[PDB]
């Protein structure tokens, strides 16, 4: 297998703008949304068909109750953060928990929090400590660190339970997450500004999104400014990317263990 990941996000907004829910919590297996919950629906629903098919009502039933409580803790934890910072108006609270099951069988785990879209607390599962960015984060840190049971549980979840779910979902969504759709690469040459010749290496219709693209001169890497295009969703479950140079040259693409070379 390639590198796969599980993640759950939480967003808490104080004093929202009529339409914006007070709380939203979304799960992903890689680039794919898998679960959704919000303060409006007050329910955990699937965001992938293979999630709906492989999880019984008892799973959605339980986690729905769990999320209502999580929603409540977020409201209180955000209010208290604002009280420390002496902040009025609308402010955001965020959380990200997750794990990666690496190509080589090795695993990683993350749990971090943010206030106003900026790093607030960052959990260290190796030292069982919280990394505080300021003195407000430091007060929450001292408090959180007092409950050794919760820290140990958080380590066990990230290290064991998380990877276990990720492995379940990978199987559930095997046909989607594990497939490989090779890229359609092309090179475009154009006399732009008088003299300047711009070469475009454009790739499309590939899955997974992770692609590597570079330009090389005579065989060696370009000691010139390569402009890179973002890996964007095509909207059909496939992705598109590019890389340009200002000019022999050859475009190099690696995607899903296959190397590609396009000379000019």
């Amino acid at each position: 297998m390639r590198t796969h990941s599980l993640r759950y996000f939480r967003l808490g907004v104080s004093d929202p703008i009529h339409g914006v829910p007070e709380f939203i919590s979304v799960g992903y297996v890689d680039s794919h949304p898998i679960t959704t919950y919000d303060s409006v629906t007050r329910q955990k629903e699937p965001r992938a068909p293979w999630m709906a098919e492989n999880l019984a009502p008892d799973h959605w039933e339980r986690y729905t109750q769990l999320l209502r409580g999580w929603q409540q803790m977020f409201k209180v934890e955000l209010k208290r953060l604002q009280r420390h910072y002496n902040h009025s108006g609308s402010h955001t609270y965020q959380r990200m928990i997750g794990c990666e099951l690496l190509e080589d069988g090795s695993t990683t785990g993350f749990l971090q929090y943010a206030y106003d879209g900026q790093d607030f607390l960052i959990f260290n599962k190796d030292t069982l400590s919280w990394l505080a960015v300021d003195n407000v984060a430091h007060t929450i840190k001292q408090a959180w660190e007092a409950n050794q049971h919760e820290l140990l549980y958080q380590k066990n979840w990230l290290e064991e339970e998380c990877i276990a779910w990720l492995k379940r979902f990978l199987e559930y969504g095997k046909d989607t997450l594990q497939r490989t759709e090779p890229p359609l690469v092309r090179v475009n040459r154009k006399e732009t500004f008088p003299g300047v010749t711009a070469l475009f290496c454009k790739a499309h219709g590939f899955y997974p999104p992770e692609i590597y693209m570079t330009w090389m001169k005579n065989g060696e890497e370009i000691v010139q400014e390569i402009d890179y295009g973002d890996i964007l969703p095509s909207g059909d479950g496939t992705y598109q990317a590019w890389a340009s140079i200002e000019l022999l040259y050859s475009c190099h693409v690696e995607h899903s263990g296959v190397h590609m070379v396009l000379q000019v």
Partner: antibody
Amino acid sequence: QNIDQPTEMTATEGAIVQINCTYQTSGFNGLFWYQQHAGEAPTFLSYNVLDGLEEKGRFSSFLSRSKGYSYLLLKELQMKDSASYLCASIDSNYQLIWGAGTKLIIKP
Amino acid sequence: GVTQTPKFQVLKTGQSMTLQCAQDMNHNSMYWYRQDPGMGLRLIYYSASEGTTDKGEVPNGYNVSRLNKREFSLRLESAAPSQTSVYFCASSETDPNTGELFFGEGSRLTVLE
């Protein structure tokens, strides 16, 4: 799924007793031990999620996540230790699954 | 901590019944259990936080109401002799609980024809 511990155990006062608890569950988020005197409310003894032994006076709790088992060790047994000992495990859906309890009988 | 009333109750088959539970500790989660001889505690109903409740393992014959953050009352609508058990009201800081689960004194309820 199933949490199993002995129905009853008997040991002599002043000796040591080890109460075993095996969890056959779909996932694991921590194991608990509760004390319950005849006709009284249960009380928290310990919570174990990571591997190892934890001493709280005459009472110790051990967990082996690989072996899917934990024990309660009572050293220097007293007549006051005559109670039931309930173990309970948390599955991947965060639900507590309680064992039937171990009635500890101490012989004076 | 957790105050639960009554300690004992005698009911006739079909009588309504309400068991009270209240907590001082500012806990968000509250639980209703029954303890029957030969088996592990069975969750009847639970409240993960104020403003929500859900079915436990044994919800038939019962209903709950999380009145506020402190009270979680159980209700037996039509008592049945199967409902003869020891009811334990419990509370914890949050759900899921990795901390101490606090139990009420217990309620011995006996249902007869």
